[PDB]
């Protein structure tokens, strides 16, 4: 409840396969900090079951290595917000998408704890997602954000 | 030289006193990164000296404590931008402030380590000022953003 913004007209098969996450933000230091932060993830790819529910692919890092994730975002009766499995079952909400270029997300648990990404299509830095992203969030109450390069971006982990 | 921009008529002496650095950026992630990362300083206090030279005193996370840190910003011909001791002797770069509630500053050694810093006079969040530091930064290349509350300003090493 503490994102205003979602995406009307979703159509979640459409979000599927490869993503990078280019930019990241978030309302606490320490969601983000450093490889093994708990927000700290990196989006791979995104399979949408036939029954709707969307399976995600991602990198996070654990030990000193870059672990491989799959994670299960279940349906909820709107179409951009999704709950994840399963402590405290996390909302994921799509507040914006063209399928094609970008999409902005945000995962939250009006309190207050809140990560969001703008995901793009390719390995490229693109100023107009990222200007989007950060128009998004200039209403939210973000205390870090990070951004990578296209080299970051063909590397496990972000590194 | 990378930073285009530097205030015109600055008067050192008028920005002796406390400051908190509010806003961080930088160029590269892992310059901020942990509470040990290289550029990640907490501003205490301005003292010039009557040379036209900057005491600063500052903290900085070293073992797993917050460290009290001492170092001189020596004056150039140009009035906006100092040189610190003394590995490839560090730039300091005065982009803009009031004396009264703002400051923003860089720091760097056109390539292409920075760090940048919107300091205020008071533990409160200055959102005309962030705005400020915002605009003077999406010209440079930054990858990471941290923002402080007041209860992290009144705190040692902003914890
Ligand atoms: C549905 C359309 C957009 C989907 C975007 C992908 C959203 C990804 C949400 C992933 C949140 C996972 C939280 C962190 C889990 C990491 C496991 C761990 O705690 O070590
Ligand atoms: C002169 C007007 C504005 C002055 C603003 C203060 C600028 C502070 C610059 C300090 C840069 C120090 C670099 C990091 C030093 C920490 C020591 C270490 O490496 O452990």
Redesign the interface.
């Given at each position: 409840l503490i994102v205003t913004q979602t995406m009307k007209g979703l159509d979640i098969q459409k979000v599927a396969g490869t993503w990078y996450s280019l930019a990241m933000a978030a309302s606490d230091?320490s969601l983000l900090?450093?490889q093994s932060a708990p927000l700290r993830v990196y989006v791979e790819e995104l399979k949408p079951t036939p029954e709707g529910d969307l399976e995600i692919l991602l990198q996070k890092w654990e030990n000193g290595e870059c672990a491989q994730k799959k994670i299960i975002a279940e349906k909820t009766k709107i179409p951009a917000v999704f709950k994840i499995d399963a402590l405290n079952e996390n909302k994921v909400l799509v507040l914006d998408t063209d399928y094609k270029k970008y999409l902005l997300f945000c995962m939250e648990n009006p309190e207050q704890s809140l990560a969001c990404q703008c995901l793009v299509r390719t390995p490229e830095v693109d100023d107009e997602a990222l200007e989007k992203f950060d128009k998004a969030l200039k209403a939210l109450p973000?205390?870090?954000?990070?951004?990578?390069?296209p080299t970051q971006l063909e590397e496990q982990c972000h590194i």
């Open positions: 230091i900090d450093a973000m205390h870090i954000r990070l951004s990578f390069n």
